Design a protein around this ligand. Structure first.
Ligand code: 2VU
Length: 239
């Protein structure tokens, strides 16, 4: 990485050590960003900016001088996880897919500890960056929804855990559509009767056990992301 002089602007001398004189300066950086267009939202911005974790897409600031009002986010090199898995189907090792779930689980455990509830945890709301890293976006439909959410709209970290179970299935199936040829009412019928998404070939028996644990009827039966994180981190290290 070489910086062209145009980008640099000297300001004042800030003393000198033994080898060379040091100066204060401003470096004009032209960085890639993802810009999302549209009292009400100005409150949300500073709070979202306080939420900092390497496994969550970062909010850099909000631009609101005039309409369309827009949010400046961290750029994620390879787009949404759903499309990433779909176009790369067959090019995935079970370790890369597990590693993707662990990435999501890290950001989710932080959001759980911060008492922030995601309402749409799905592979489409997860993004791929440098060296296949996965980060969570759109934090603050029935296929990823837990019984309490499609029946009574009762959101919590445990409903986010259900969504994570569906996300894990999307990851290990390499971006396949959950309950593909079923409608919003058919999905509700099947889940209530106790049926769950099949074990994908790439997922081990232990990974599928974790998925079904995220898919328990009672939300208090489902494990916390803090519990899910320690478990997945062990499988990722031991193999
Ligand atoms: N240079 C270049 C270039 C040009 C075209 C396509 C791509 C590949 N690609 C990368 C993305 N990245 C993003 O979409 C993205 N990167 N950061 C994001 C944040 C949000 C977001 C939405 N709500 N909250 C966050 C949504 C989307 C993003 C999409 N396609 C890269």
């Amino acid at each position: 990485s070489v910086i062209d002089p145009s980008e640099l602007t000297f300001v004042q001398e800030i003393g000198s050590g033994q080898f060379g004189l040091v100066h204060l300066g401003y470096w004009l950086n032209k960085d890639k960003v993802a810009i999302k267009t549209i009292e009400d939202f100005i409150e949300e911005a500073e709070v979202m900016m306080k939420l900092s974790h390497p496994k969550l897409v970062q909010l850099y600031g909000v631009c609101l001088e005039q309409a369309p009002i827009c949010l400046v986010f961290e750029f994620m090199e390879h787009g949404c996880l759903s499309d990433y898995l779909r176009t790369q189907r067959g090019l995935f090792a079970a370790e890369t897919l597990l590693g993707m779930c662990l990435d999501v689980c890290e950001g989710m455990a932080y959001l759980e500890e911060a008492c922030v509830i995601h309402r749409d945890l799905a592979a489409r709301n997860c993004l791929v960056g440098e060296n296949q890293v996965i980060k969570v976006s759109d934090f603050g439909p029935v296929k990823w929804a837990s019984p309490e959410v499609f029946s009574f709209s009762r959101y919590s970290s445990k409903s986010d855990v259900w969504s994570f179970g569906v996300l894990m299935w999307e990851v290990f199936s390499e971006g396949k559509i959950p309950y593909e040829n079923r409608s919003n009412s058919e999905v509700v019928e099947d889940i209530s009767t106790g049926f769950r998404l099949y074990k994908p070939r790439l997922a081990s028996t232990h990974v599928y056990q974790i998925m079904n644990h995220c898919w328990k009827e009672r939300p208090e039966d489902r494990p916390a992301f803090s519990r899910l994180l320690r478990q997945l981190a062990e499988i990722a290290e031991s193999g």
